[PDB]
């Protein structure tokens, strides 16, 4: 879940 806050800062 919270996994997805990796892309969010990344892109």
């Known amino acids: ?3 997805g806050k990796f ?3 990344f892109x």
């Open 1 to 3: 879940h919270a996994e």
């Open 7 to 9: 892309t969010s800062e």
